[PDB]
Amino acid sequence: MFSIIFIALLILLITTIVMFLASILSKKALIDREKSSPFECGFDPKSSSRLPFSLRFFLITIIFLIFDVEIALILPMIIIMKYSNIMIWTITSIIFILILLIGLYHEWNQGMLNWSN
Amino acid sequence: AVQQVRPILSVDREEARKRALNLYKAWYRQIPYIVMDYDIPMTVEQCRDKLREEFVKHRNVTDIRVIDMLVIKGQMELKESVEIWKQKGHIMRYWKESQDPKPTDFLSKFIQGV
Numbered sequence: 001m002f003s004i005i006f007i008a009l010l011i012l013l014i015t016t017i018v019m020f021l022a023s024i025l026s027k028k029a030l031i032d033r034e035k036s037s038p039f040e041c042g043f044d045p046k047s048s049s050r051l052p053f054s055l056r057f058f059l060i061t062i063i064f065l066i067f068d069v070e071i072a073l074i075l076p077m078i079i080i081m082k083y084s085n086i087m088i089w090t091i092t093s094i095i096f097i098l099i100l101l102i103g104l105y106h107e108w109n110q111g112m113l114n115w116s117n
Numbered sequence: 118a119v120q121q122v123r124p125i126l127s128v129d130r131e132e133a134r135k136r137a138l139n140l141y142k143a144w145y146r147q148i149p150y151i152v153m154d155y156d157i158p159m160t161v162e163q164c165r166d167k168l169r170e171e172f173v174k175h176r177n178v179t180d181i182r183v184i185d186m187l188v189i190k191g192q193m194e195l196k197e198s199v200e201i202w203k204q205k206g207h208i209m210r211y212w213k214e215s216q217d218p219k220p221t222d223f224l225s226k227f228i229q230g231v
Contacts, residue, residue, distance in 0.1 A: 033156065
């Protein structure tokens, strides 16, 4: 850790210096009211980008939060296979992956994995 | 010297007068939005004068069909300005800012040349 943090800072300093060189090495010209205008294919923009952007994969978005938190429970598997009771480890692991598949196929069949339409 | 014709939008001058006023409403409502959404020098009071100035151009118009067409074209611009299809340049085109005044007095025109 403490080694990694030091190099993490050292890299961040180095990368930071890079633009601090770029900001000075960059040619400097007077900024225009149009030069800094946004790019939207050369025609002025109708709509701010900060309007509410509708969402259609919201349902998947929530399911993503869940499925990760079961990744927290499969990852330890390997580490404790040499040390655990094989029946308990075998049984539980399987009924862990079957539960996941059944959940997935259930929603897939119910059509929730499809986007809002 | 009269002829039978097909009406454009209205049947009576009073209806035409009624339509024209609505076009004034919609423009007069819209000026505050145009100032915000266009990077142009003009302010609401200046623009609200330009609306008055030009509705006055067509002061002597009499034919209802001509008044209909002015209101058809007049409405078309407003939709193109209620939308921002018209760009910053086009809106300021209503002022002819680039063109500088040409003097009208005879002596000035003569000295300046044709």
